Design a protein around this ligand. Structure first.
Ligand SMILES: C[C@@H]1O[C@H](O)[C@@H](O)[C@H](O)[C@@H]1O
Ligand SMILES: [Cl-]
Ligand SMILES: [Zn+2]
Length: 422
């Protein structure tokens, strides 16, 4: 079956080292400013919806400003929508004239500009690509969604698979190195009996094509189930691995590198009525919790129809970056800690070092259930002040002089041996 290349293994380890990326959902739906699902939610006719492209002009778009504001947060990569459910391509494809260059007065390939700036600025580029299409008539038979977009013709599914293959080829050919392909949407056909099989979705052909073009490119698929052979990362939508508070998960944690995706406000695409952006404290803690469960955090912003990133999102990214300036070594380059997440916080680890991230504790002591490795020292990460501890065969007890500050009271524990990997 699938044995991943060595460049692919390095790519997985670098991805886990990086820990933090930014999601970008941008399209012509940003004009309606009611979320990226508006075409299906309001049952918009595909022709009338497509008429919006000839008025799309994000005049204030600036790839350099975007990538700079994201880099400033500590994030190391950007995952951007190359084509979402509405079928509109945000790059210069030759498989359809329904794209940013040919169908709008903007006439610019924004994915190419962003790739150039990511190269220049040391940020890796990941591409989201939708298996689901609400406009094309060769997406036949239909799944659960999209029955109200006014399609009145049928094509062959083979033609749609060819279309996807050629678009994937283009994206892996004209834009430099691509960190990952992020498939989404096959959950649409989970109503038919064979709706989540690799053969209906042509997954083996597609994955093999991807890895032939760029063997170090990682593949993830947001299907919410057990990863298919060929995927290089596992995705959890709006939940940490092993949690299901949002109801879109519940699948077993595989052995692939893990990534949790989340929105900074409540919606992926720009939504003018949704201005409730999570606080900087919440976002820092979300990243720390992700890292403590051995997962990356892919945090989303939805660009405005004038081309700017929301100002509040840029503020949050800058404040997260101020925090990262001090604490990134306790997150980036680490893995999930030997003590798994607890109500008080989490732990990350690197070599012989265990970082204890105390996120939610008002007592002045903390029990760590870990034994068999001589603890040789404990200090506060920032101040370097020493932390009193008692170690025995049952575990470790840390005692604090003050009881802890927000948003993260971090202790650095140094052990004699190891730290293990479960
Ligand atoms: C990937 C994100 O979660 C879901 O899968 C999608 O339906 C959303 O539009 C968004 O792209
Ligand atoms: Cl980690
Ligand atoms: Zn170029």
């Amino acid at each position: 079956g699938y044995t991943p290349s060595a460049d692919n293994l390095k790519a997985r380890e670098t991805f886990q080292d990086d820990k933090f990326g930014i999601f970008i959902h941008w399209g012509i739906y940003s004009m309606l400013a009611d979320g990226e699902w508006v075409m299906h939610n309001k049952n918009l006719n595909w022709e009338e919806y497509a008429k919006l492209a000839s008025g799309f002009y994000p005049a204030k778009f600036n790839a350099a400003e975007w990538v700079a504001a994201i880099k400033a947060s500590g994030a190391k990569y950007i995952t951007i929508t190359s084509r979402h459910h509405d079928g509109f391509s945000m790059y210069a494809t030759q498989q359809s004239d329904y794209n940013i260059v040919d169908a709008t007065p903007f006439k610019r390939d924004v994915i190419h500009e962003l790739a150039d700036e990511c190269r220049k600025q040391g940020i890796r580029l990941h591409l989201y690509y939708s298996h689901l299409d609400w406009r094309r008539d060769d997406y036949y038979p239909l799944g659960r969604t999209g029955k109200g977009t006014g399609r009145t013709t049928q094509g062959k599914w083979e033609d749609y698979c060819a279309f996807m293959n050629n678009q994937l080829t283009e994206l892996l050919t004209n834009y430099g190195l691509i960190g990952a392909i992020w498939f989404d949407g096959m959950w649409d056909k989970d109503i038919y009996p064979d709706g989540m099989t690799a053969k209906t979705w042509n997954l083996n052909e597609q994955y093999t094509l991807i890895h032939r073009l760029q063997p170090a490119c990682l593949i993830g698929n947001n299907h919410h189930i057990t990863p298919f052979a060929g995927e290089d990362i596992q995705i959890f939508e709006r939940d940490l691995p092993g949690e299901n508070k949002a109801g879109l998960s519940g699948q077993d944690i595989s052995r692939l590198p893990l990534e949790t995706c989340e929105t900074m406000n409540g919606m992926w695409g720009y939504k003018i009525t949704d201005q409730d952006y999570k606080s900087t404290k919440i976002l820092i803690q979300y990243l720390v919790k992700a890292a403590g469960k051995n997962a990356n955090l892919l945090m989303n912003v939805g660009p405005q129809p004038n081309g700017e990133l929301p100002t509040v999102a840029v503020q949050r990214l800058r404040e997260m970056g101020e925090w990262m300036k001090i604490y990134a070594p306790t997150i980036q380059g680490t893995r999930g800690g030997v003590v798994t997440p607890r109500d008080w916080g989490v732990t990350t680890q690197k070599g012989k070092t265990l970082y204890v991230h105390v996120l939610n504790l008002d007592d002045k002591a903390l029990f760590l259930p870990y034994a068999g490795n001589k603890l040789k020292s404990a200090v506060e990460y920032q101040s370097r002040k020493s932390v009193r501890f008692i170690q025995d065969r049952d575990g470790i007890l840390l005692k604090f002089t003050d009881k802890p500050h927000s948003p993260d009271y971090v202790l650095e524990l140094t052990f004699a041996n190891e730290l293990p990997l479960n």
